[PDB]
Design a protein around this ligand. Structure first.
Ligand SMILES: [Ca+2]
Ligand SMILES: [Ca+2]
Ligand SMILES: [Ca+2]
Ligand SMILES: [Ca+2]
Length: 116
């Protein structure tokens, strides 16, 4: 019986000025009385850390009973008009009973430009 860890949705969106984007990680399956650890980390798409979004990483803990965890990523605003850009948040290193990654364990985040 295997706990799976995955993002609640595979795609998130925000405007450049949204300040931060919230992402939800689900735990489903197996024995929910176990504690589960999952690492997370941003990766550039066409949007770049230090420029369009803030580099973010960490470990999330699903304590017993917990099925939903929220993580936040900083979005950087500017006043230049350009195309919409995306980046990635990968999940990894799941630790418990067996727990592992499900689908999707990468979320893609599109920042929509709000200028012009
Ligand atoms: Ca920008
Ligand atoms: Ca703007
Ligand atoms: Ca802009
Ligand atoms: Ca547009």
């Amino acid at each position: 019986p295997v706990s799976k860890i995955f993002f609640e949705q595979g795609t998130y969106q925000c405007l450049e000025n949204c300040g931060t984007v919230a992402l939800t990680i689900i735990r489903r399956g197996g024995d929910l009385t176990n504690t589960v650890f999952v690492d997370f980390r941003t990766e550039d798409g066409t949007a770049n850390a230090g420029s369009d979004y803030e580099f973010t990483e960490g470990t999330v803990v699903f304590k017993p009973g917990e099925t939903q965890k929220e993580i936040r990523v900083g979005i950087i605003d500017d006043d230049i008009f350009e195309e919409d850009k995306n980046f990635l948040v990968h999940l990894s290193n799941v630790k418990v009973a067996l727990a592992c990654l499900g689908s999707p364990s990468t979320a893609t985040v599109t920042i929509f430009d709000d200028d012009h």
